[PDB]
C-alpha cells in the first residue's frame, strides 16, 4: 500500500514545524499538537541529530498525554530509538506497548525489526 521513500520530510516542512514550535515556546505555552507534530517530523528525518531531538520532545510530551496519546508517543519513541540503534530503549518502549495492546500489528512488526537489527549487530536483549 506504499512505496519506500528516502526523504520522508522536506527541509521546508521541518522548518515550518520548528518555527511554530519555537514561536510557542518563546511565548510560554506549547500546544501538545505543535510539539508532537514537530517531533513526528524529526523522527522521520534522515539525520541523527533530528531524530534525537524528536525523542527528547516525545519524552517531554509523555506526562501530558491521554492514555491513547501516550500509546502513540511510546510508539514513536520506539521508532526513533530503533532508528538510532538505541535497542534497549526501543525494546523497552515497544514491549510495554505490546503488553498494553497485544493486538497491535504495528508494534509487533516494529519489535520484529528491532530483533532482526540487534541480531544483525550480534547483540542480545
Amino acid at each position: 500500500m506504499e512505496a519506500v521513500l528516502n526523504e520522508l520530510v522536506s527541509v521546508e516542512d521541518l522548518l515550518k514545524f520548528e518555527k511554530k514550535f519555537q514561536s510557542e515556546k518563546a511565548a510560554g505555552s506549547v500546544s501538545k499538537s505543535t510539539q508532537f507534530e514537530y517531533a513526528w517530523c524529526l523522527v522521520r528525518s534522515k539525520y541523527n541529530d533530528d531524530i534525537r531531538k524528536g525523542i527528547v520532545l516525545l519524552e517531554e510530551l509523555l506526562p501530558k498525554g491521554s492514555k491513547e496519546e501516550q500509546r502513540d508517543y511510546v510508539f514513536y519513541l520506539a521508532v526513533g530509538n530503533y532508528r538510532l540503534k538505541e535497542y534497549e530503549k526501543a525494546l523497552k518502549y515497544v514491549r510495554g506497548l505490546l503488553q498494553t495492546e497485544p493486538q497491535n500489528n504495528q508494534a509487533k512488526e516494529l519489535e520484529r525489526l528491532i530483533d532482526k537489527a540487534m541480531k544483525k549487530d550480534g547483540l542480545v536483549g
Binding site: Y82, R83, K85, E109, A117
Partner: peptide, 11 residues
C-alpha cells in the same frame, strides 16, 4: 557510527 536505520517501511 553513522546513518540511522531506515524509517520502518510499513509506516
Amino acid at each position: 557510527k553513522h546513518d540511522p536505520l531506515p524509517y520502518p517501511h510499513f509506516l
